[PDB]
Write a protein that binds this ligand. Structure first.
Ligand SMILES: COc1cccc(OC)c1CNC(C)=O
Length: 123
């Protein structure tokens, strides 16, 4: 049980996504971009990603580790910077704040998971 629990990341990521869903800054990133309505999005973005897809992928058990989840969430933010490159866009600003919040909170989820990993690999 809980010391170096290698499953704990799952619940912690579910909680973090819940917080993200609550932030007004996530509003543009909650659902896939409507690709039949916003035409050039796919001209610019190779692999769309959004927080509802991340939440569903976690709920389905299809993330092997919190590093996989982290990769998808990072893709949301890199996509925004590619599609909305301008520092004066308020949407650029939203993405930037929300990314900082995510990176702050995911930090301990990753180090705890890796700690656990190195513990059980050692013993
Ligand atoms: C097609 O992209 C659009 C279209 C309208 C508004 C808008 O910003 C709310 C965006 C940018 N959305 C993302 C997720 O990059």
């Amino acid at each position: 049980s809980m010391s170096y629990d290698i499953q704990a990341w799952k619940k912690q990521c579910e909680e973090l996504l819940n917080l993200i869903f609550q932030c007004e800054d996530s509003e543009p990133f909650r659902q896939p971009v409507d690709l039949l309505e916003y035409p050039d999005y796919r001209d610019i973005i190779d692999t769309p990603m959004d927080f509802a897809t991340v939440r569903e992928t976690l709920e389905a058990g299809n993330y092997e580790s919190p590093m996989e989840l982290c990769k998808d969430v990072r893709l949301i933010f890199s996509n925004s910077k590619a599609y909305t490159p301008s520092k004066r866009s308020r949407i650029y600003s939203m993405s930037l704040r929300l990314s900082a919040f995510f990176e702050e909170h995911i930090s301990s989820v990753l180090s705890d998971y890796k700690s656990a990993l190195r513990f059980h690999k050692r013993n």
